[PDB]
């Protein structure tokens, strides 16, 4: 029976002790402490060696990425790539700390665009009329000048030209995940999440990749250079096989919608994830998948019955850097080659 | 009493414009007239007032849609690659999957059955659970039922609703022969499948007037769902492909189809229930015409985490997705409560004109 | 096992059938249907006769109000009196349909002020600077000209004069509930909730009655006419005895904060309410009493273990008129004398 | 590609002012420096950015408070009826009851112990659970624990926290003799009890440096709680009055005490954790000076239902509760996560000046 007790600042500002104290502070501070424990359990599983039998079964993917004792799926909505959590996610991917990424179209394109031009701080209350008259697009309390997307068009159209040519003369069958690997190779910039993902053979799934600026560009491009196909069926096999042949899986899901459901549904194919942390502000009462508690996923078989999943009800821009500080960042040496 | 205090609390006020509307609730001393009760939400305040504003926005869409036009039928079909005739207002209706598991399925089905909207957008669950409900029902439960006991009994939870695993076994038996035919048609009849084309096929096959997608294909209302693999239809396509390889679902052609629905519209309205892809994909299509003319959002998401789901309509104005001169409305509510009321006051009142 | 099925508009717009269909529609529509059932159960208990033994025990209050088989506590936050739900609540109180009211200071004063001047529709986004420069106060998307409070001051100061005089020459010991009955008698207007409450011997509790414009006025008044006392201890005995000697109780609570906790805590004194409906938009995850589910109150003994309470997660301006339409309003003849 | 479509999507943009701040998160290739990590929230966006803005607002309060003044000590005490000396910024700290059950109790206690704020406002639970924690602890649990089983074991739930019934039995034994003395002092020494005066007495009696209210009375920090009867202290006053009748708690005199704290301030700041009375009562006091100079809200309430709890700081500007020229901040978060971080970056950095 653990007693409630908050950090005592009479001790001074001892940051690690202050963070450790969230576990006995209560409400979402305690859920944060539980999330640190769940993620550290994923990491300590991941670093355990594969036995001969485990290695046999897990080798049954055709994937270039070396397999580990715990395959970690990291999912996040577009807004988090607009935010500075882009840097947090880039770090994890750069150091091979996670194994599969799932994001929406915005979460791909805004990473690449930030390599061409920055996003700026604003306010939620800025009025749409005056912004639109000035070509400034609003993302929460962030601002993206539309010139950013004009730079994106310039950068992307030559790649689209090459992709159709490789499709039609070299037999390439494009999928969202194959396109995202190509885009990461092209951006060729170490600040980019997708640069490191393709370098480290970390696949990125985004079944609705046409829902965004990338879609705008493909759409415009298709009038002059018709026939690009993006197949989502092959990518469904690819993500599902990541779960099916894992020794263990963990899910770290930031936000809701397709990124949350698609990771969870893949893990149903192995009868459930072993570890899971949600971080989002959605609420269950309207029945949405976004606001469903981890225990709903247990009824489907998406999380194992014997798992101890946790949801932190909070804006991930506040807690995800703190979570990484207390978990992956303390084990960085183990992830380096 | 301190003089500055008195001056701060008892400050003079300007007179408000003469057309300012007073707050006043429905008076049950009149008895119960449900029409008058709903009309009274407009002057009740808070989200009741936004509901009244949403009635007005949707009634404006409908009245626009009912205006005659003269436009060349053959060129419209050619630029949109669609058999659907243009009207004076193209209405896009988007809804998340949970609402198809709820009884809002019936509400949506009624609108599509009577050809009252022009474009549907939903996620994968919002397709498959309409079809599965023609095979077996969904049941009432509670949000607090524990997942371990449910899982051990083969029962899956959707909010406070429940669906047995066996529903999906029936879905599998129904779907597998259709997937066989789709692969045969792709490989020997040149069909280039996309989600919308598959959803039209599935509605024709289910052949059941309780289904949204049966009515949608009958009435030539396309359904866009660019992540159609993310659910049970996905599971089935996946298992089927190891028995019968080769099905492809392209999303590029469906992007051309939805965007041209917005580009070549005379007017557009957006009615969006929930967040995620369904909200963003409709709004982004409408950026292609420099913005929708009318818009109603009904969802429970909040802006403060920067999510697109929680963004107010005025964020969409900044992008060009809603016109600067539109008067869009968001109702902050569970759509299971307010969408039937909204339909009662709008489309269902205009049923005569839709014949 | 009840199947999900929504209202079919092919039947036409049959309003009562449409409302009845919320119960099988799911999510908060089903919780609304359950709330209709809980409230109708309060009403059908309330109309059951008191047996001789029940009548004996329930007569042990010194209260002028005739006792009934189910004592219904109605609680609501200030914003709902600013809104047109003021009319809904006035109707229930006018026809003796509820037995105890609990509200905050704003929920008293705005009822009285609406008898002097109206509240107007506005928008949530109106900016505070321009409003303040014009003396317009904002309540959500409603607007109250500050002249309304100047009219309140004019109306109220003579009553405060009389109350101190009766305190100091006639032995009157003021409490919030006694002041609210007096204010309702003085406003003498059938549009006012508190007019009907005092006429029908329905007590109104508001332990923090000084937190609002009423407080402002008492404060200003106390410089020229010092010594008014408002005792909250006596009002605590009064509300608790309403629960202790009830045959059955129901709680209908709109909103959170003190109105919710104070009704629930009174009912702990009888080992729990028999029926309960919450309607509010607060969420449980921060640990607040406002966002606690009814099942939290069960652990305290504030709701009986064998009750079937329900929370509707929604803005009460949308659902409370619908709830009243389906419950109290259909039994109006039984409440008339 | 349709020309209007291209023009709508590829619209030119104005250049933003040169001092515009770029978004950029903390880079863990630097390793883990927690100070730099917290500083990085300012440029991370969404509520992380509001957290950084809240650090700045509170640091501005503190810096103002540390400015010297010359003001007549005797007249200030007479107009406020308070022994507390005036400083250059009077800070009001408000917090709902649940936060005293959480470990935020320790955070608040530290601030009051070091005399860093001037006025506390809390609800009844926020008083009594501080005192009870000096008798017996609160435990960690889960939100989903069922009330029937808990009730049958005599365990009471507060969110995901748990407190046994026996905690309140210990409270009863401790409190009853003190209530006896209060009635004796009212009836034969002329004491006119109010909530603040009772809370000062209870803090002196608990005599325990882990208690917020022990430190508050030692440092002459008044605690306002105008519905002090709404909780366990209420239960005890109630049961006690049938054994020893006559205790009165007046709220009118406490209204005079809190309002004069705002009226006679040089500057004020408001730090408000949660909603309800604690938020409204501090803000209303500050209307008496035509508005607070600085304000930080931390709560999870939303505006859309019109509640005062969910109102943004800009609503308070319309009333005169926050000055038109202030730059107030709300962080949309559970205070159990962000208040210790906020204190770490503000008051706890200034500990040297507060000695």
Curated annotation (Swiss-Prot), chains B, D:
Residues in the signal sequence = none
Q: Which UniProt keywords apply?
A: Disease variant, Hypusine biosynthesis, Intellectual disability, NAD, Phosphoprotein, Transferase
Question: What's the catalysed reaction?
Answer: [eIF5A protein]-L-lysine + spermidine = [eIF5A protein]-deoxyhypusine + propane-1,3-diamine
Keyword Transferase assigned to the entry: answer is yes
Biological or metabolic pathway of the protein: Protein modification; eIF5A hypusination
Q: What is its EC number?
A: 2.5.1.46
Going by the record, the broad EC class of this enzyme is transferase
Q: Which Gene3D superfamilies match?
A: Deoxyhypusine synthase (3.40.910.10)
Amino acids binding NAD(+): 97-101, 123-125, 129, 230, 275, 300-301, 334-335
Mind telling me which InterPro entries this protein's record contains? Answer: Deoxyhypusine_synthase (IPR002773), Deoxyhypusine_synthase_sf (IPR036982), DHS-like_NAD/FAD-binding_dom (IPR029035)
Q: Where is the active site?
A: 321
Q: Which cofactor does it need?
A: NAD(+)
Sorted alphabetically, which Pfam families does this protein's record hold? Answer: DS
Outcome, altering residue 230 to A? Strongly reduced NAD binding. Strongly reduced formation of covalent intermediate
Disulphide bond pairs: none
Q: What SUPFAM superfamilies has UniProt attached to this entry?
A: DHS-like NAD/FAD-binding domain (SSF52467)
The GO biological-process annotations, alphabetized, read as: glucose homeostasis; peptidyl-lysine modification to peptidyl-hypusine; positive regulation of cell population proliferation; positive regulation of T cell proliferation; spermidine catabolic process; spermidine metabolic process; translation
Q: Which GO terms describe its cellular component?
A: cytoplasm; cytosol
> What this chain does, per the record?
Catalyzes the NAD-dependent oxidative cleavage of spermidine and the subsequent transfer of the butylamine moiety of spermidine to the epsilon-amino group of a critical lysine residue of the eIF-5A precursor protein to form the intermediate deoxyhypusine residue. This is the first step of the post-translational modification of that lysine into an unusual amino acid residue named hypusine. Hypusination is unique to mature eIF-5A factor and is essential for its function.
* Protein's UniProt name: Deoxyhypusine synthase
Which species is this UniProt entry from? Homo sapiens (Human)
């Amino acid at each position: 029976s653990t007693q409630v007790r908050g950090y005592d600042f009479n001790r001074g500002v001892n940051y690690r002790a202050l963070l450790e104290a969230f576990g006995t502070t209560g409400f979402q501070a305690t859920n944060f402490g539980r999330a640190v424990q769940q993620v550290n359990a994923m990491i300590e599983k991941k670093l355990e060696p594969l036995s001969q039998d485990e290695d046999q079964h897990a080798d049954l993917t055709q994937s270039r990425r070396p397999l580990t004792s715990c395959t970690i799926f990291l999912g996040y909505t577009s807004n988090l790539i607009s935010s500075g959590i882009r840097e947090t996610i880039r770090y994890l991917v750069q150091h091979n700390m996670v194994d599969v990424l799932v994001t929406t179209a915005g979460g791909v394109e805004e990473d690449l665009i930030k390599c061409l031009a920055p996003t700026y701080l604003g306010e939620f209350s800025l009025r749409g009329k005056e912004l639109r008259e000035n070509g400034i697009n609003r993302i929460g309390n962030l601002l993206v000048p539309n010139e950013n997307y004009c730079k994106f068009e310039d950068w992307l159209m030559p790649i689209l030209d090459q992709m159709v040519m490789e499709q039609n003369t070299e037999g390439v069958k494009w999928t969202p995940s194959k396109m995202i690997a190509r885009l990461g190779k092209e951006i060729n910039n170490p600040e980019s999440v997708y640069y490191w993902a393709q370098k480290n053979h970390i696949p990125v799934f985004s079944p609705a990749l046409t829902d965004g600026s990338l879609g705008d560009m493909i759409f415009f491009h298709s009038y002059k250079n018709p026939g690009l196909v993006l197949d989502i069926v092959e990518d469904l096999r690819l993500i599902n096989t990541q779960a099916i042949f894992a020794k263990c899986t963990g899910m770290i899901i930031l936000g809701g919608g397709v990124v949350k459901h698609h990771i969870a549904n893949a893990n149903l194919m192995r009868n459930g994830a072993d570890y899971a942390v949600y971080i989002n502000t959605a609420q269950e009462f309207d029945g949405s998948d976004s606001g469903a508690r981890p225990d709903e996923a247990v009824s489907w078989g998406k999380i194992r019955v014997d798992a101890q999943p946790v949801k932190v009800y909070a804006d991930a821009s506040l807690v995800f850097p703190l979570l990484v500080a207390e978990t992956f960042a303390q084990k960085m040496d183990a992830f380096m080659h």
